[PDB]
Write a protein that binds this DNA or RNA. Structure first.
Ligand SMILES: [Mn+2]
Ligand SMILES: [Mn+2]
Ligand SMILES: [Mn+2]
Ligand SMILES: [Mn+2]
Lengths: 103, 78, 96, 95, 94, 105, 95, 87
DNA sequence: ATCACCCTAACCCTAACCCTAACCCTAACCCTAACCCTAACCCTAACCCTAACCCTAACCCTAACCCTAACCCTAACCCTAACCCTAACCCTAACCCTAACCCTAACCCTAACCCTAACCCTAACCCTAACCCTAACCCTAAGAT
DNA sequence: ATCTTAGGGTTAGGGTTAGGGTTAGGGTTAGGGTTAGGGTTAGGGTTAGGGTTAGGGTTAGGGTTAGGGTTAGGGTTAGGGTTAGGGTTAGGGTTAGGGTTAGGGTTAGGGTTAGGGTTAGGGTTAGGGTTAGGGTTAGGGTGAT
């Protein structure tokens, strides 16, 4: 497999097929699906990491969309990257403005 | 059916948004703003359904319409 | 008897630290089918498509409340008024 | 019926790497699938434009490279550009 | 050197039909060229997606039409969809 | 008629648009009527703009339309403003508007 | 001697009614070359590219002033304050 | 043929009168004194974000000269699409 | 409420500079002929939605009260607009020269073309833990002595 | 604070459904080899951007007086919040009908390929018109008498 040749879990072969089928360009370089499958795999790992840690602090083992939202909105970069995105069943980060706090 | 989106249902959405005091005029203004949002999304979703030569508006049609509106939705097969 | 703005603060924490939908599924499903009939008659909706619409609506409205509240606080207030929703939507590029 | 593609097999494999003592819900797997598909299009589309702007007929890893620099943040972008060139290098080593 | 494409010939033709006394500055012609190019890629891209969504290998005038309906307003869209089907019909005749 | 634009009654280039659709990576194939429909939609929109701009040029006593006239035409329409909402016309200036609260007593 | 807010109102009409740039071309060209070199050295700028940057900046800032002014008027004021610029950028999704 | 000169503090080149004019076009009557620095901060951020992408385009094109198109493509990426400089 | 002066606006024509209407030549659109794979029919399986029943029970709704936020006015400084003058430095049209882009020539291999082969992952089924759903608890501040 | 009051987080127990570990095989990726062109080489033109001279007059910086917008006070009113019990209506629970979506088989035809042909339109040079910039012009409304 091309994924094994690159040390990846993400499918290098599939990504290469989606790039030519998706109408992005006439030809697709040999290293482009490899670089891309790696960038996608990295970002997935980066998210899964912070999401697993959110479930670790809520006494759960399985990550639900709430854990994904908590991971995204608590990061600065993941929040900016997924700024105009809505995670279904994610809820909001708990924040109450200081002016609304009791006197 | 626009009144089915009740005054207590609107107050819960304000609480999640971190709102302490809610004016009485708000409940009607929110109903107006929700109607606009729904119109805009469903209009494009249906435009997708009609292009697909279908009678049933699929989850994908609602997803594509949301991406067009810049309110991209994660989790519905996108 | 609780003071004004004590059950309100309890409600905020109750809902923020939660993900359940805040509009009942049937009143919403009626509103969706009503609005749809205006663009096309004889319309069917996938169960999932309605839920995709409901999630989108609430997530939008909660975010709109967030900005609205910031507008109320900007004008030295604690209660959200239509002029705050309007200012939020105008600067958001939905109004003018 | 029809075949339905999915990145679930890989999201599971990668989950095992970061948290083997952690799992994933059906809805959360959908959120992860929507995330991969969105970012796939985001990068692919930006690279499609780069190739086009520079009158080139091929999307090479150099187009993916600069698309990630434009789309991802300096930090996340710095680590993605790293893991990317790394996987490419490793692929060139093994035939 | 290299030749540089432009919709200036057509923006001039269309200007005369509308205002036959009125002229156009070099900068304003640039703004008109940017307008045509932007809307070209806005429609073409939306039609490219429509064709993709419905597992189709071709962009036909049906993809252009629904792209118009999605991107421009009913009024502007209504008159563009009119002006469009008309030109298509006339082309099929000749 | 020998040009495809003449067959369709258009000023906009039907042949060029068809070439750009293929040469732009939008799909595998391009329908016969797609460049015709598109050249027509583009021609309609440019005529719609040119119209309101020539009107703003005639108001400013000018013979030639400058980018100011284009901006005035766009922002004074409701649909052109919405269509070009997140667009910046270089050398366009702003619509003259002073809030009522800032007006003298 | 004019009253406070009489030359201010004349200035508003004077500038809204015009299109000329409001920042001098050379101070701005220095700022552009400073920012761009601090970031990547040995850089050249097309005359047009700098003007494209200047137009973009002013058009942005004028639009930012528009929203900022609406925030001052919202809090019963006539003068723009940093807390208005901040609120405008917060709601605009710039944070 | 030798070397260049040092570039420093040019954000002050965006003077208080230049900032006033932009406020007038935006329909501003009263301008706080703190504004002039806050605007300089916000302009610097905007310029950084645009030039960063413009230069990323220039570098990808294997060029040393940042063209009008690079600034245009950078603006479209930022969602501040600019008409009149090509494209 | 009556005059004085500062402003934009508008006349004058002179003023350069930009537009456009000429030129012609270069290339991209058009014609036409084989060319195949998409998309058009056709039917028909098997899907998923709607229609319409039930039983409370969570939830909506009116009206029970007073708390305190919004609002107004008045009056407190003090911040920001308006005026002036000095000398910068931005703008001006020059001047140059070479680094930096790119034409366009030559050749190689990187990519796509075919197929057939192993090999991965969809679609299924199944069980069993993870989480849900209840009760009674400690903890924690909430409101007022 | 110190007095009673609510309630929501806390543990624990035993329920239900869905992760996720299983199955076979469909269809996808992969490794054979042929073939064509896109992009990589070296190059020269040649533009164009950077910096250099040159001048001046616009435009900025910096302190001035004081005008009025900002924000403080308290005091008037009532808008929304809390509490409550009457009771609508949403929420599963679980049936069937049959229009809807669409899998897959045949057949045609629309869009692609091809090079020679020819027209449009890119670039070019060039006169004169619209616009530009410098002069006064009265009218106009501002803001002290
Ligand atoms: Mn006052
Ligand atoms: Mn009331
Ligand atoms: Mn044909
Ligand atoms: Mn020309």
């Amino acid at each position: 497999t091309r994924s094994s040749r690159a040390g990846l879990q993400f499918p290098v072969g599939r990504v290469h097929r989606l790039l030519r089928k998706g109408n992005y360009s006439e030809r697709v370089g040999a290293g482009a699906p490899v670089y891309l499958a790696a960038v996608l795999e990295y970002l997935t790992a980066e998210i899964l990491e912070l999401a697993g840690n959110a479930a670790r602090d809520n006494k759960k083992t399985r990550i639900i969309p709430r854990h994904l939202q908590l991971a995204i909105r608590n990061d600065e970069e993941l929040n900016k990257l997924l700024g105009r995105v809505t995670i279904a069943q994610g809820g909001v980060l708990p924040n109450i403005q200081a002016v609304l706090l009791p006197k | 059916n626009i009144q089915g989106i009740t005054k207590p249902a609107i107050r819960r959405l304000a609480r999640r948004g971190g709102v302490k005091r809610i004016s009485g005029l708000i409940y009607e203004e929110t109903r107006g703003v929700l109607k606009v949002f729904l119109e805009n999304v469903i209009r494009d979703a249906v435009t997708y359904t009609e292009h697909a030569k279908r009678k049933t508006v699929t989850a994908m049609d609602v997803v594509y319409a949301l991406k067009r509106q810049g309110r991209t939705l994660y989790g519905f097969g996108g | 008897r609780y003071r004004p703005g004590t059950v309100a603060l309890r409600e905020i924490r109750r809902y923020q630290k939660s993900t359940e939908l805040l509009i009942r599924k049937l009143p919403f499903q009626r509103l969706v089918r009503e609005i749809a009939q205006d663009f096309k008659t004889d319309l069917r909706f996938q169960s999932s498509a309605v839920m995709a619409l409901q999630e989108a609506c609430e997530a939008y409205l909660v975010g709109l409340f967030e900005d609205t509240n910031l507008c109320a606080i900007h004008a030295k207030r604690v209660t959200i008024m239509p002029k705050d929703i309007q200012l939020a939507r105008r600067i958001r590029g939905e109004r003018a | 019926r029809s075949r339905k593609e999915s990145y679930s097999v890989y999201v599971y494999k990668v989950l095992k790497q970061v948290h083997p003592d952690t799992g994933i819900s059906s809805k959360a797997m959908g959120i992860m699938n929507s995330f991969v598909n969105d970012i796939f299009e985001r990068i692919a589309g930006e690279a499609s434009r780069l190739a086009h702007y520079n009158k080139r007929s091929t999307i090479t890893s150099r187009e993916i490279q600069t698309a990630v620099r434009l789309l991802l943040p300096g930090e996340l972008a710095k680590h993605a550009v790293s893991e990317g060139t790394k996987a490419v290098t490793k692929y060139t080593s093994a035939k």
